[PDB]
């Protein structure tokens, strides 16, 4: 497609809205509020990255490192053992979020620590991403170019590895300087060897703005948990929440429609988001 074809209105067949009139009010407030007040807060995996390509499942960006040749079989077995231990805690309906926090911190820290026992060098991150079949949603060029041209900050949150995310966007030539990645970044020594992780730890239950005049927000996600990503932004006046519903659609549709203003069901593209951005940014 040309970049001019990377735009769609809200009448697209993938679009669901519980309150279409409220959506129009929100969009109107964002437009009249101006580009100078806007920020975009987005999840990465299966939101900006693509779930399927002409119906064929794409690999998850979360699995790029774990599925690559730069970690040993021993390390892969240990990461699987951590998953089998901690995943039941993550999904336990009898524990509060606060109760899950120390265990998620422990899981993420142990998994990062295992990576630090490998012999990973910085240049290998780009290699493993180059060899992966991970893809960005169709229409990413217009999405990233529009936010960059209009000076709109884009905060991309991910509980995965920041270096992997960053490399995907870099290799697609859209790593523009309005992008601010909030994720788990590796720390490399002067010889380029992985020696630790930097900064705030981002796991599934603290992926929000407490980890980072832009009082108007567009939030993009694909999970129910992603609805909290703007928590911690001070003074938000208007927010539009857009959710991609990629799978388990019968189980999830009603809850997604009650919680997100716009749901995009089985939509491999950013076209509806790009159309809203063009309308909002005039
Ligand atoms: Mg996601």
Numbering used by the authors: -1 to 210, 221 to 290
From the study:
5’-Cytosolic nucleotidase IIIB (cN-IIIB) is one of the most recently discovered 5’-nucleotidases and has several unique structural and functional features. However, one of the most preferred cN-IIIB substrates is m7GMP, for which the activity of dephosphorylation is characterized by one order of magnitude lower KM constant compared to the other preferred substrates, whereas kcat/KM is comparable. The crystal structure of cN-IIIB consists of two distinct domains: the globular core domain (residues 1–51, 132–182, and 215–300) and the smaller CAP domain (52–131 and 183–214). The core domain is a haloacid dehalogenase domain (HAD).
To date, these are the first coordinates obtained for human cytosolic nucleotidase IIIB. The second domain mainly consists of a bundle of helices that are responsible for recognizing the ligand. The C-terminal part of the protein (residues 291–300) and one of a loop connecting domains (residues 211–220) were not defined in the electron density map, and thus are most likely disordered. In all three crystal structures, the magnesium ion was octahedrally coordinated by the carboxyl side chains of catalytic moieties of Asp 41 and Asp 230 and the backbone carbonyl of Asp 43 and by three water molecules. The differences between solved structures: the holoenzyme of cN-IIIB • Mg2+, and the enzyme in complex with inhibitors: 5d or 5d’, concern mainly two helices of the CAP domain, which move slightly down and left towards HAD domain by about 3 Å. Ligand-binding triggers substantial changes of Tyr60 and Trp105 sidechain conformations to form a system of aromatic rings that stabilize the complex. Crystals appeared in a few days at 4 °C after mixing protein with 0.1 M MES (pH 6.2) and 22–28% PEG 3350.
